[PDB]
Design an enzyme around this catalytic site. Structure first.
Site, PDB file in Angstrom:
ATOM      1  N   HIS B  41       0.803  -1.220   0.000  1.00 37.87           N
ATOM      2  CA  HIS B  41       0.000   0.000   0.000  1.00 37.87           C
ATOM      3  C   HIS B  41       0.853   1.297   0.000  1.00 37.87           C
ATOM      4  O   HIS B  41       0.291   2.390  -0.071  1.00 37.87           O
ATOM      5  CB  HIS B  41      -1.084   0.018   1.099  1.00 37.87           C
ATOM      6  CG  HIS B  41      -0.598   0.168   2.511  1.00 37.87           C
ATOM      7  ND1 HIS B  41      -0.189   1.393   3.014  1.00 37.87           N
ATOM      8  CD2 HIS B  41      -0.607  -0.733   3.520  1.00 37.87           C
ATOM      9  CE1 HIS B  41       0.086   1.187   4.292  1.00 37.87           C
ATOM     10  NE2 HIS B  41      -0.140  -0.082   4.642  1.00 37.87           N
ATOM     11  N   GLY B 143       2.361   6.093  10.187  1.00 39.23           N
ATOM     12  CA  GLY B 143       3.775   6.023   9.849  1.00 39.23           C
ATOM     13  C   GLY B 143       4.445   4.751  10.353  1.00 39.23           C
ATOM     14  O   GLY B 143       5.588   4.472   9.985  1.00 39.23           O
ATOM     15  N   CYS B 145       3.505   1.693   9.633  1.00 34.34           N
ATOM     16  CA  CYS B 145       3.345   0.624   8.639  1.00 34.34           C
ATOM     17  C   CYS B 145       4.686   0.116   8.187  1.00 34.34           C
ATOM     18  O   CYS B 145       5.604   0.906   8.007  1.00 34.34           O
ATOM     19  CB  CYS B 145       2.509   1.098   7.459  1.00 34.34           C
ATOM     20  SG  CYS B 145       0.786   1.442   7.865  1.00 34.34           S
TER      21      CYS B 145
HETATM   22  C1  LIG Z   1      -7.060   4.531  11.198  1.00 33.67           C
HETATM   23  N1  LIG Z   1      -6.480   4.631   9.870  1.00 33.67           N
HETATM   24  C2  LIG Z   1      -6.682   5.677   9.072  1.00 33.67           C
HETATM   25  O1  LIG Z   1      -7.465   6.585   9.351  1.00 33.67           O
HETATM   26  C3  LIG Z   1      -5.878   5.736   7.782  1.00 33.67           C
HETATM   27  N2  LIG Z   1      -5.344   4.449   7.346  1.00 33.67           N
HETATM   28  C4  LIG Z   1      -6.174   3.785   6.328  1.00 33.67           C
HETATM   29  C5  LIG Z   1      -5.576   2.473   5.866  1.00 33.67           C
HETATM   30  C6  LIG Z   1      -6.383   1.537   5.212  1.00 33.67           C
HETATM   31  C7  LIG Z   1      -5.869   0.326   4.783  1.00 33.67           C
HETATM   32  C8  LIG Z   1      -4.529   0.061   4.980  1.00 33.67           C
HETATM   33 CL1  LIG Z   1      -3.874  -1.465   4.447  1.00 33.67          CL
HETATM   34  C9  LIG Z   1      -3.699   0.965   5.619  1.00 33.67           C
HETATM   35  C10 LIG Z   1      -4.220   2.171   6.091  1.00 33.67           C
HETATM   36  C11 LIG Z   1      -3.354   3.115   6.910  1.00 33.67           C
HETATM   37  C12 LIG Z   1      -3.321   2.642   8.365  1.00 33.67           C
HETATM   38  O2  LIG Z   1      -4.270   2.046   8.880  1.00 33.67           O
HETATM   39  N3  LIG Z   1      -2.214   3.016   9.059  1.00 33.67           N
HETATM   40  C13 LIG Z   1      -1.972   2.866  10.446  1.00 33.67           C
HETATM   41  C14 LIG Z   1      -1.298   1.781  11.011  1.00 33.67           C
HETATM   42  N4  LIG Z   1      -1.124   1.576  12.325  1.00 33.67           N
HETATM   43  C15 LIG Z   1      -1.647   2.465  13.159  1.00 33.67           C
HETATM   44  C16 LIG Z   1      -2.358   3.618  12.749  1.00 33.67           C
HETATM   45  C17 LIG Z   1      -2.888   4.565  13.662  1.00 33.67           C
HETATM   46  C18 LIG Z   1      -3.518   5.688  13.208  1.00 33.67           C
HETATM   47  C19 LIG Z   1      -3.655   5.920  11.843  1.00 33.67           C
HETATM   48  C20 LIG Z   1      -3.173   5.022  10.930  1.00 33.67           C
HETATM   49  C21 LIG Z   1      -2.513   3.839  11.348  1.00 33.67           C
HETATM   50  C22 LIG Z   1      -3.951   4.522   6.904  1.00 33.67           C
END
Ligand SMILES: CNC(=O)CN1Cc2ccc(Cl)cc2[C@H](C(=O)Nc2cncc3ccccc23)C1
Ligand SMILES: CNC(=O)CN1Cc2ccc(Cl)cc2[C@H](C(=O)Nc2cncc3ccccc23)C1
Ligand SMILES: [Cl-]
Lengths: 298, 301
Positions: B41, B143, B145
């Site tokens: 991603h 960040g 990921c």
């Molecule tokens: C809660 N997530 C969001 O609002 C944005 N997200 C959407 C999303 C969708 C699918 C996939 Cl595979 C990746 C993501 C991204 C995601 O999950 N990264 C995050 C990872 N770990 C902790 C995270 C805490 C806070 C934010 C983002 C985190 C980015």
């Protein structure tokens, strides 16, 4: 999201762990530049009398699969300093710092000069650490990493009869009224680190847990009268000042968060948990909460 | 003495963390030999996330579109391929800090260490378990990921997890290092939610044996149970079914303490019924399930 008991990355410290052997005793040493630091009990013990009988070659130091040659030895308080021929090329930027009770740090537990695990823990108000150590763990170290600098704050020396641990700073001065020898010594009555429980309540609010909040406030004096009753450390104006950023970020005044803690102490959790815990957590400082809920790197 | 949630020393993993940037997106990569592994991603925009065609987005990229940073040094990408939900970036420099390693796929209930990183820089290390619902209760921010989960057994680092996303309940989902997700999750911003979570019964039992080894016997009783009667009770508390494999796995701890697995099951049945009554077990007022039988033997013996 998420809140874990998190330690500093141990890599910079792993590159300093060596095995020190003197006679039948084997424990860990910290190899920084051309000196190996280790507990002096590796040698009613008169440590000047036992040390004067030793020569450099009586100390076997092993760094991985390489034997280091000891070229000198001296004692500073309860730490033995072994001068070696080779300077550790993996020596990081470091300081020796003495911490205060309530302050937290990472422990790299080692056996035979090999690091086996890393955990986070706090210096208790009674100067002990609730660690996880077995025989052979002596010489394991506690540290914090600030930017690129490793601040060494603890060296493990012994286990007390209640299963808790006692040690020194890297200058060999013990934390607590302990002595390095087999004698009747016990940890004093422990207290809860109030500023740390409050920091952890602010961490819960940041993570979406607000059930314990109430409309009430308290004076610092009324809170301390209640804290003294529940074996909680007195909360000072410095603690209140230190919690300021968390208070401003969440919109909950420190004395407002103190009234939530007062209610939790007098009434319990009532089948509820805070950050997956049924007990009030006191081993995260206000700085640990800011560092974890903001993502600071090393 | 003492029992702590203990993580593996992170040093061997820290030396593999790199920063991967593709357009506006920046996340972590794992640099092993001449390959950098990271979530696919990284090639997506935020809009692409609803229904991304990764093969279509990847075919439009060239090697030079991926910026890889290892410390203060930029690595040159000489190739790229996709394997399931992981992007593999072939680089021109082999990591000299590459440890002895394996890619392992774990089962629910297994534990591992997480080196949480932001911008290719490690910020912390913690211990956690693969939950029965295939999620991990981690501590991650945006960040993070590409951060990895691992175990170190002897001198070999077994990579078992790569972080990809946060689900709406605050829990986390990711893949093994071959890009296969744990659970029914997809790297899409679709309505997906973690299934009902359950307690890892074999781990709670292992932790009760750890408490007996450390001198705590207050919770033991004079009863035994059949495996079937235990499961009928434990299921009513949302505990995972205990299998004969779990019973076999607990054998060494049973032999070391002198308490039969089904006798320790009878204690657990009673603890679920009564609670702790103001008491704690290994400094905990809840029944701990993120220590495996292997973790208990490792830390106590
Ligand atoms: C809660 N997530 C969001 O609002 C944005 N997200 C959407 C999303 C969708 C699918 C996939 Cl595979 C990746 C993501 C991204 C995601 O999950 N990264 C995050 C990872 N770990 C902790 C995270 C805490 C806070 C934010 C983002 C985190 C980015
Ligand atoms: C409980 N301790 C003992 O029976 C033997 N001890 C006596 C003693 C006395 C003074 C000093 Cl300074 C050090 C020691 C030694 C000691 O405490 N090392 C240990 C350290 N950490 C965890 C330990 C778990 C188990 C055993 C030993 C540990 C060795
Ligand atoms: Cl597994």
């Amino acid at each position: 999201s998420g809140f874990r008991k998190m330690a500093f990355p141990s890599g910079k410290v792993e590159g300093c762990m060596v095995q020190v052997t003197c006679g039948t005793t084997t424990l860990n040493g910290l190899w920084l530049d051309d000196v190996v630091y280790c507990p002096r009990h590796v040698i009613n013990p008169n440590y000047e009398d036992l040390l004067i009988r030793k020569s450099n070659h009586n100390f076997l130091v092993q760094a991985g699969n390489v034997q280091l040659r000891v070229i000198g030895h001296s004692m500073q308080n309860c730490v033995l300093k072994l001068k070696v021929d080779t300077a550790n090329p993996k020596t990081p930027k470091y300081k020796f710092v003495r911490i205060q009770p309530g302050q937290t740090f990472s422990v790299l537990a080692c056996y035979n000069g090999s690091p086996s695990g890393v955990y986070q823990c706090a210096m208790r108000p009674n100067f002990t650490i609730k660690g996880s150590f077995l025989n052979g763990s002596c010489g394991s170290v506690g540290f914090n990493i600030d930017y690129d600098c490793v601040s060494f704050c603890y060296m493990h020396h012994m286990e007390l009869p209640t299963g808790v641990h006692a040690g020194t700073d890297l200058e060999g001065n013990f934390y607590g009224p302990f002595v390095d020898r087999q004698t009747a010594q016990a940890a004093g009555t422990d207290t809860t680190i109030t500023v740390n429980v409050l920091a952890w309540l602010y961490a819960a609010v940041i993570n979406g847990d607000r059930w314990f909040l109430n409309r009430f406030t308290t004076t610092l004096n009324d809170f301390n009268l209640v804290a003294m009753k529940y074996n909680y450390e007195p909360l000072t104006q410095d603690h209140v000042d230190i919690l300021g950023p968390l208070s401003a970020q969440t919109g909950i005044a420190v004395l407002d968060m103190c009234a939530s803690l007062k209610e939790l102490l007098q009434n319990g959790m009532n089948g509820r948990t805070i950050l997956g815990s049924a007990l009030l957590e006191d081993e995260f400082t206000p700085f640990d909460v800011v560092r974890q809920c903001s993502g600071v790197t090393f």
